[PDB]
Design a protein around this ligand. Sequence first.
Ligand SMILES: CCCCCCCCCCCCC/C=C/[C@H](O)[C@H](N)CO
Ligand SMILES: CCCCCCCCCCCCC/C=C/[C@H](O)[C@H](N)CO
Lengths: 235, 235, 285, 285, 238, 238
Amino acid sequence: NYHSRTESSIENFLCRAACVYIATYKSAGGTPTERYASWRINTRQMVQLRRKFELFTYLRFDMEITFVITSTQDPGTQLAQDMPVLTHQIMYIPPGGPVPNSATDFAWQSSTNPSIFWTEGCAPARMSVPFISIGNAYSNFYDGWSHFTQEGVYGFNSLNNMGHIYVRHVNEQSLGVSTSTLRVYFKPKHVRAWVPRPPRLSPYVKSSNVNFKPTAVTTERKDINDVGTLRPVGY
Amino acid sequence: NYHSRTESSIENFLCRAACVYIATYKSAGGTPTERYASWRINTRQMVQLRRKFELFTYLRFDMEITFVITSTQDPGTQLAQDMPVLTHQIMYIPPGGPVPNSATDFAWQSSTNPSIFWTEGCAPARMSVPFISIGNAYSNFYDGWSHFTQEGVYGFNSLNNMGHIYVRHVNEQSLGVSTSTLRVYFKPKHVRAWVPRPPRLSPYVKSSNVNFKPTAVTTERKDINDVGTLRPVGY
Amino acid sequence: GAQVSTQKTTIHYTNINYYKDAASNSANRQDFTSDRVRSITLGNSTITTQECANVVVGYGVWPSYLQDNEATAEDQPTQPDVATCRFYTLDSIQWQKESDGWWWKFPEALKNMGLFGQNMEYHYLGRSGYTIHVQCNASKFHQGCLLVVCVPEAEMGCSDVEREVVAASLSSEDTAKSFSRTESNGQHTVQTVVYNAGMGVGVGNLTIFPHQWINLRTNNSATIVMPYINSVPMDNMFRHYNFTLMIIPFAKLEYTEQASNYVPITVTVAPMCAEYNGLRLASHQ
Amino acid sequence: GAQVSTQKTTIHYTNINYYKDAASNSANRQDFTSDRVRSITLGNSTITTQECANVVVGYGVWPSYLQDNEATAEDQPTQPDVATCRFYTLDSIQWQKESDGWWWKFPEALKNMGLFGQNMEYHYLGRSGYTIHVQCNASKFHQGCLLVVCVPEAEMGCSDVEREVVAASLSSEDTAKSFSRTESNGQHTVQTVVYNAGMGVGVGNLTIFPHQWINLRTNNSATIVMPYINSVPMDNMFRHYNFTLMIIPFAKLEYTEQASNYVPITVTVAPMCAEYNGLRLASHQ
Amino acid sequence: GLPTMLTPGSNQFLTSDDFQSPSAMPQFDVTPEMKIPGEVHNLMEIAEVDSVVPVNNTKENINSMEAYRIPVTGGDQLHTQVFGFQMQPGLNSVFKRTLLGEILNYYAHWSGSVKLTFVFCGSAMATGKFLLAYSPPGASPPQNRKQAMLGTHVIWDVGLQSSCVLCIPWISQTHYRLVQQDEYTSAGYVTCWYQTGLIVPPGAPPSCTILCFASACNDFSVRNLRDTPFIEQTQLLQ
Amino acid sequence: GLPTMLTPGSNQFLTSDDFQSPSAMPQFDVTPEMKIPGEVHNLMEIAEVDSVVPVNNTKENINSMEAYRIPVTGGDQLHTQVFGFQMQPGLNSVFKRTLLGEILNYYAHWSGSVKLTFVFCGSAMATGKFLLAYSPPGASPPQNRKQAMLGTHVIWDVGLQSSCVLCIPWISQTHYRLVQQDEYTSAGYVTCWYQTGLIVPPGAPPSCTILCFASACNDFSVRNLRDTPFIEQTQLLQ
Ligand SMILES: CCCCCCCCCCCCC/C=C/[C@H](O)[C@H](N)CO
Ligand SMILES: CCCCCCCCCCCCC/C=C/[C@H](O)[C@H](N)CO
């Protein structure tokens, strides 16, 4: 009976950084939406983290956000020949702030916003954010409408008001064209989990509600009293 | 008699990092098995470490794994002209986990798996792993079959269930093609060694069993009472 | 400062916090080791359950008030103790052989009964614990089983993908929506298949939520004393469902030729310690 | 914390552990300084060895039980002390002039003798120490030598490369496999050359494993009290061989014309403190 | 200043780490703590709650609800086996989508004692005895009752009590068995056989339905963590 | 913060180091400790166990088992030398695949006293005396018994006792002699000569076989560590 559980705790089950978003943004003139890359902060994009959160109804944690920003070189002509290091800027936007329309905008100063400048060839950039919500818990399921007359959106997409992370390059790149990809990682710590609930049997299809297709319970075996194999797979 | 042994201990005989594997993986599209490089964790690949382990029947140690990941440039055309630093990702897979089929797969998130991202031009990446087995000792010799009816594999290849290390690039490399080589090093510490046993006289031929060809005992000298040379090799 | 502790194998570790924020420290990851029947009289309407029957008290906790220690309201008008505590009886659903299942949505299922739909129609906020008691009259030759479960925040998926759901199809006014043993083909209705329980989870895995069994052999009724579970302490009851009952028969009822075939099922909920805040002269509808 | 020690040449070193795991510290690398004959009566069958002969007690330890301090089983049924402790005698191998050698595999060499092959045929687990006693009747004009050795986990290589071995060729049922002084040409048999001892090691280097010599000048018999050596505390005896006897004559036997030429060799093992676990109504074969 | 040396392990991003980091919202007070009921502490408390196991998991039945109801027909059988399954809590079709299995599938190694409680949903007047036997891995699955009797077993009187529970014991060579059990580190078969035959009176229906609940006993443990091979995705779902 | 300076030795991978490193399996408990017998502490305890040395290592004999058996024919010889070898425990063909040599071959420097125990495998009635003499490096190998007598020697009566042991003494200019001994830091020759001649009676076979066991005395030490020039490979063997 001296086999107690340490790696089954609520911390070690949830203190592992999972990838949440995959962005892509170039560094050239023309098509200004390709220069920056916006993302409203969900946890519902990637599945590998979503199933771990949707075992509990409510949560409350502090987080550790990290970014592995890597870049390539775009094909074609007029390439760099030689290229200094290129730095990236990650800006958080709170709910209700002014967003930049494009790159080199007026609003990229970020006096109040917690921007962070990161150089390539270094360690991945890291920050900590506390339990930030108006409510007392990050509710993973909200069985209720938005308006009191029962219209509007339905589901968890009413208390997910966490603003956006808008990333951009801060070099002009006079000669060449080069994309970069952003990979956001969430590692929640000091986690508390309330009201457990079953895992999702059906596959995920949306990031707005709990839509699903009716799937089978388990896989099929041969008979009611099938014991599998009596000897190995040979002969 | 004041010539006691310090460098003859079980630690200093076995606390030296030996190379265990040599991988090679490119960074181009097409032939997706050339993008990543898998390795089931043996110690039986390289001989220089294998003979040091096969002096004792059982072992129990904690390990220090290190990787000197170096890369070249592949010949041909459409080369980089200029190239930022390229980072590598080393992922451990436990026994019974989902493996990636190729690069840019869905399963490269590694929420539970202990991945490690390493940048070129830095110190080699390092991690510590504890004594991880279901048994009480890493048995180097298992004189017994797998199945209770005496079929299946025979030898040490039944308790070596340590999963695999799958390595990949995490840059797209839009222009060029470039391979990289992985060199895994095992340095066991806190070593305990049970039931010593003779060194292997015959050369090694396999990494699955103790197959061998019947070799001579020692080299041949001239006579029964040959003392070698009585004077130097001159005259 | 200068702390020393133990690690999971002398060996120790000295970690210091170098930052002026509580959410900037590392993760903790360390532990410091003719017959007698009971009669619930609530309000002015009693029940009679059994002497031998267990009563499941929610998620461990009894339903209680919201004290001044954890209130965020401005002014707190009165809560009634007799006017809204009665055992209100809803409509009687009818159990047949091939009956799939039934569900309810209780903050929007008591809007017509008593004053519970006459207090929450005026006040803005709301908070109440519930004392569900579901019963079916048994006999010794009427084999069959039942499962009740009060799932909280039972977000239900729509029948057709890339659609929302409609309030007419999610809840009903006095009736319990059936649980098609097959798949609904609707364009705006709910995906009401019975082997996925609406939410998409496995229907065998509904046993985490407070649950009780109404096995016709050894039980006549079932009583779940559910507590108020919500993240925010107070939320309006017309745009939020606190939980959801689900009565799913796992084993179908099999009578004989000379036996009764109109076995009913009733639900007799009763709100415990119902609190209200924010009186606005609204009269919602 | 804040430790000070010595190094191998005042001079000291202060190393701290900065991590919360026991396997993350550095390596330690520091030390803190008509005639009288004995008769073994085990079970109900004795032997008579010598007064002057040494008995090799395994790897230093006497065979003992598996206490509750290091048990991982669920329930532990009984172990017999009389029923399986007798000195079981195996078949008598015959020593000639050009005899190469013989081996055995003892967890699968006692399957027919007594109840030791009638307890392990039912129970799943197994654990027993052994008390091998090998004897050959001597005379003063019968020069020759012998080496016995109980090698543990004697993984034997196949005769042909990129093949496995077969259970019919690795062990035998009642007979000891010969050790060809030359090389076997088989496609699935064992590589049974005598100057590599099967495992590929030098046959002169078999003296680490508990060994004894049956030199015909100064010894008549040999007794090795081998202990149970395995990593796991309990493993099944039908898919695992605990150790392996190897009787290799280093010096051939040379008699004269008017002398006996049928010198035999017997082995008389006896399991000590045999424990069993996991009774399953199986009756293996 | 201080002449440090950068050891190997610098400028890396090991995922399962515990490092400090500067705060992005400095001096940001939080909402005060509330006592929501059901505050779970360890994940294994979900694997102590019973979840019905789909014992009749046949191909036609799995899609339907009738995969959880195991048939116990009344008559003279005395040879029919109501059910049998290898007790592999991780790979076996019977236990993998059950709550015990889903938490277990996340963790690579499993050690403990599983408990199967078989409820009887049937007429009050019905009476019968069933022998449920955990046969350890040994040799071959039990095929007749006499073979099952030798292995550990419980005789359950359906009439005297519904809900008989069998705590399958932990008998294993190793402290931990991998969730993806191989022939080595595998687990024994579990089977149920008629002892007397269900006796149902004229007024009640002869057929009855028995269901199986599986939850780990208190002494259950997990050892490693890994991706669940049950859920997947293709693209960033939007 | 702290203004350190990166000394030379930064970002390197010296193999024979001792540095800390973060753990990849955090909070991972281990299997508890078991007492397997034969827990060796130092490697030199393998070099205290005797291993037969192939003294008759002739070209035809090495392939055969008859390389460990040294001939001691019975007759009037009084000049024949049963065996002679330079006492180089590392390079010499006689001692290199023996257990003492194999551990020694791993370590570059050797210091201690070797012990050779020569057992007699022969008829009980046989009786003879042999002089085994360690001649120090001095000048030339002993070629007749009178030359051998001067150097340290033991007279062994085969009849009175089998297994006479000679502890070859450590007489050397340097504390440590390299395993790859050169003319400098070399070791003296060891030889065995008949003293009386084996006397075997009519009923026993005249020929007898003597074998040699070599193990280091308690005071043996190693000083460096290096690749063994005995085993090799070509590719990654699969
Ligand atoms: C460093 C710059 C970026 C800073 C980003 C701000 C912090 C990130 C937002 C925290 C996310 C909270 C966790 C989940 C919130 C919601 O409850 C879930 N999405 C539920 O759908
Ligand atoms: C940092 C990512 C990679 C992590 C790799 C996991 C740890 C490496 C496995 C430890 C190897 C154990 C030592 C040898 C095990 C077996 O007993 C031998 N192969 C015997 O053949």
